[PDB]
PDB file of C-alpha atoms in Angstrom:
ATOM      1  CA  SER A   1       8.127  27.134 -10.326  1.00  0.00           C
ATOM      2  CA  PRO A   2      11.936  27.360 -10.723  1.00  0.00           C
ATOM      3  CA  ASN A   3      14.255  30.263  -9.951  1.00  0.00           C
ATOM      4  CA  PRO A   4      16.405  31.601 -12.765  1.00  0.00           C
ATOM      5  CA  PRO A   5      19.405  29.213 -12.904  1.00  0.00           C
ATOM      6  CA  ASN A   6      21.914  32.002 -12.242  1.00  0.00           C
ATOM      7  CA  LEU A   7      20.099  32.912  -9.016  1.00  0.00           C
ATOM      8  CA  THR A   8      20.355  29.381  -7.624  1.00  0.00           C
ATOM      9  CA  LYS A   9      24.022  29.431  -8.557  1.00  0.00           C
ATOM     10  CA  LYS A  10      24.624  32.774  -6.869  1.00  0.00           C
ATOM     11  CA  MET A  11      22.883  31.588  -3.695  1.00  0.00           C
ATOM     12  CA  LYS A  12      24.910  28.379  -3.461  1.00  0.00           C
ATOM     13  CA  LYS A  13      28.176  30.199  -4.131  1.00  0.00           C
ATOM     14  CA  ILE A  14      27.447  32.825  -1.466  1.00  0.00           C
ATOM     15  CA  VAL A  15      26.425  30.214   1.110  1.00  0.00           C
ATOM     16  CA  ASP A  16      29.457  28.056   0.269  1.00  0.00           C
ATOM     17  CA  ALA A  17      31.767  31.029   0.855  1.00  0.00           C
ATOM     18  CA  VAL A  18      30.084  31.802   4.168  1.00  0.00           C
ATOM     19  CA  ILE A  19      30.358  28.173   5.280  1.00  0.00           C
ATOM     20  CA  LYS A  20      33.996  27.602   4.247  1.00  0.00           C
ATOM     21  CA  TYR A  21      35.201  30.956   5.592  1.00  0.00           C
ATOM     22  CA  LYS A  22      38.163  30.574   7.957  1.00  0.00           C
ATOM     23  CA  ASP A  23      39.555  32.737  10.756  1.00  0.00           C
ATOM     24  CA  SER A  24      42.944  34.104   9.507  1.00  0.00           C
ATOM     25  CA  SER A  25      44.786  33.469  12.791  1.00  0.00           C
ATOM     26  CA  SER A  26      43.562  30.059  13.947  1.00  0.00           C
ATOM     27  CA  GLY A  27      42.459  28.701  10.560  1.00  0.00           C
ATOM     28  CA  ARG A  28      39.200  27.701  12.250  1.00  0.00           C
ATOM     29  CA  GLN A  29      36.074  27.391  10.088  1.00  0.00           C
ATOM     30  CA  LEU A  30      33.617  29.710  11.853  1.00  0.00           C
ATOM     31  CA  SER A  31      30.431  28.070  10.519  1.00  0.00           C
ATOM     32  CA  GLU A  32      30.959  24.673  12.203  1.00  0.00           C
ATOM     33  CA  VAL A  33      28.552  24.964  15.144  1.00  0.00           C
ATOM     34  CA  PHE A  34      26.057  26.710  12.839  1.00  0.00           C
ATOM     35  CA  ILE A  35      25.727  23.886  10.285  1.00  0.00           C
ATOM     36  CA  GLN A  36      23.289  21.738  12.247  1.00  0.00           C
ATOM     37  CA  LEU A  37      21.419  22.689  15.406  1.00  0.00           C
ATOM     38  CA  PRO A  38      21.218  20.245  18.311  1.00  0.00           C
ATOM     39  CA  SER A  39      17.846  18.489  18.535  1.00  0.00           C
ATOM     40  CA  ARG A  40      15.047  19.754  20.782  1.00  0.00           C
ATOM     41  CA  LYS A  41      15.689  16.745  22.996  1.00  0.00           C
ATOM     42  CA  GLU A  42      19.375  17.636  23.284  1.00  0.00           C
ATOM     43  CA  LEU A  43      18.908  21.365  23.886  1.00  0.00           C
ATOM     44  CA  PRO A  44      15.300  22.067  24.924  1.00  0.00           C
ATOM     45  CA  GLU A  45      16.103  25.591  26.175  1.00  0.00           C
ATOM     46  CA  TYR A  46      17.116  26.652  22.659  1.00  0.00           C
ATOM     47  CA  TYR A  47      13.721  25.960  21.124  1.00  0.00           C
ATOM     48  CA  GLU A  48      11.931  27.787  23.930  1.00  0.00           C
ATOM     49  CA  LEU A  49      13.978  30.935  23.435  1.00  0.00           C
ATOM     50  CA  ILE A  50      14.317  30.806  19.651  1.00  0.00           C
ATOM     51  CA  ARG A  51      11.041  31.181  17.745  1.00  0.00           C
ATOM     52  CA  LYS A  52      12.378  30.401  14.275  1.00  0.00           C
ATOM     53  CA  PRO A  53      15.265  27.901  14.501  1.00  0.00           C
ATOM     54  CA  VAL A  54      17.465  27.784  11.392  1.00  0.00           C
ATOM     55  CA  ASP A  55      20.859  26.301  10.467  1.00  0.00           C
ATOM     56  CA  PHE A  56      22.953  26.131   7.282  1.00  0.00           C
ATOM     57  CA  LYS A  57      21.646  22.636   6.527  1.00  0.00           C
ATOM     58  CA  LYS A  58      18.140  24.078   6.474  1.00  0.00           C
ATOM     59  CA  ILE A  59      19.331  27.021   4.348  1.00  0.00           C
ATOM     60  CA  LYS A  60      20.976  24.699   1.793  1.00  0.00           C
ATOM     61  CA  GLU A  61      17.771  22.669   1.670  1.00  0.00           C
ATOM     62  CA  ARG A  62      15.744  25.813   0.984  1.00  0.00           C
ATOM     63  CA  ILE A  63      18.066  26.796  -1.844  1.00  0.00           C
ATOM     64  CA  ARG A  64      17.696  23.342  -3.412  1.00  0.00           C
ATOM     65  CA  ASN A  65      13.908  23.515  -3.146  1.00  0.00           C
ATOM     66  CA  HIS A  66      13.726  27.084  -4.551  1.00  0.00           C
ATOM     67  CA  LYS A  67      11.983  28.426  -1.437  1.00  0.00           C
ATOM     68  CA  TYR A  68      14.172  31.518  -1.627  1.00  0.00           C
ATOM     69  CA  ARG A  69      13.011  33.579  -4.596  1.00  0.00           C
ATOM     70  CA  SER A  70      15.801  36.166  -4.413  1.00  0.00           C
ATOM     71  CA  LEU A  71      19.050  37.015  -2.639  1.00  0.00           C
ATOM     72  CA  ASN A  72      16.947  39.064  -0.216  1.00  0.00           C
ATOM     73  CA  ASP A  73      15.040  35.918   0.775  1.00  0.00           C
ATOM     74  CA  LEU A  74      18.321  34.102   1.362  1.00  0.00           C
ATOM     75  CA  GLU A  75      19.736  37.086   3.253  1.00  0.00           C
ATOM     76  CA  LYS A  76      16.754  37.051   5.626  1.00  0.00           C
ATOM     77  CA  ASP A  77      17.385  33.470   6.689  1.00  0.00           C
ATOM     78  CA  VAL A  78      21.139  34.009   7.083  1.00  0.00           C
ATOM     79  CA  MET A  79      20.535  37.134   9.177  1.00  0.00           C
ATOM     80  CA  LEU A  80      17.936  35.186  11.167  1.00  0.00           C
ATOM     81  CA  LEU A  81      20.532  32.456  11.810  1.00  0.00           C
ATOM     82  CA  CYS A  82      23.036  35.002  13.087  1.00  0.00           C
ATOM     83  CA  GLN A  83      20.416  36.880  15.130  1.00  0.00           C
ATOM     84  CA  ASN A  84      19.312  33.648  16.753  1.00  0.00           C
ATOM     85  CA  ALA A  85      22.925  32.963  17.694  1.00  0.00           C
ATOM     86  CA  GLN A  86      23.180  36.469  19.127  1.00  0.00           C
ATOM     87  CA  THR A  87      20.037  35.816  21.167  1.00  0.00           C
ATOM     88  CA  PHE A  88      20.929  32.395  22.591  1.00  0.00           C
ATOM     89  CA  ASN A  89      24.618  33.051  23.084  1.00  0.00           C
ATOM     90  CA  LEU A  90      25.951  35.695  25.431  1.00  0.00           C
ATOM     91  CA  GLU A  91      27.423  38.891  24.052  1.00  0.00           C
ATOM     92  CA  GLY A  92      31.201  38.637  24.110  1.00  0.00           C
ATOM     93  CA  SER A  93      31.122  34.887  23.501  1.00  0.00           C
ATOM     94  CA  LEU A  94      33.131  33.256  20.716  1.00  0.00           C
ATOM     95  CA  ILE A  95      29.990  31.958  18.994  1.00  0.00           C
ATOM     96  CA  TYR A  96      28.325  35.374  19.335  1.00  0.00           C
ATOM     97  CA  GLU A  97      31.305  37.071  17.682  1.00  0.00           C
ATOM     98  CA  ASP A  98      31.526  34.325  15.053  1.00  0.00           C
ATOM     99  CA  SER A  99      27.906  34.975  14.051  1.00  0.00           C
ATOM    100  CA  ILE A 100      28.754  38.651  13.578  1.00  0.00           C
ATOM    101  CA  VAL A 101      31.613  37.753  11.241  1.00  0.00           C
ATOM    102  CA  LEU A 102      29.412  35.299   9.322  1.00  0.00           C
ATOM    103  CA  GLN A 103      26.915  38.152   8.797  1.00  0.00           C
ATOM    104  CA  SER A 104      29.614  40.333   7.291  1.00  0.00           C
ATOM    105  CA  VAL A 105      30.940  37.532   5.098  1.00  0.00           C
ATOM    106  CA  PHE A 106      27.490  37.119   3.545  1.00  0.00           C
ATOM    107  CA  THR A 107      27.191  40.850   2.909  1.00  0.00           C
ATOM    108  CA  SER A 108      30.677  41.076   1.361  1.00  0.00           C
ATOM    109  CA  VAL A 109      30.426  37.922  -0.758  1.00  0.00           C
ATOM    110  CA  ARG A 110      26.983  38.932  -2.031  1.00  0.00           C
ATOM    111  CA  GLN A 111      28.438  42.270  -3.151  1.00  0.00           C
ATOM    112  CA  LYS A 112      31.393  40.625  -4.908  1.00  0.00           C
ATOM    113  CA  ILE A 113      29.162  38.125  -6.703  1.00  0.00           C
ATOM    114  CA  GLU A 114      26.633  40.845  -7.543  1.00  0.00           C
TER     115      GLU A 114
END
């Protein structure tokens, strides 16, 4: 059964803003390494440490298939993505800090769109 059309549209717009968000000093798009995880074959240690692997490709797929039934459902997977990054990457690392910023972008953009 389909989500209300406005909900799908809000989810895509929020995710798009998170993905295209750029660092205001370097101009670097923070989401780049988060779009698609390396395969299990490429990075076996990741899938041993991370119980629920998720990337933005998977999140976009789940929007398209209406698996998220609310912005809270979407938020859970985005927060899971960032938490996974914070688990696999060391605190103080660029990717670690990027995942923190991506968290805050989601929260801010959701509020603006809401």
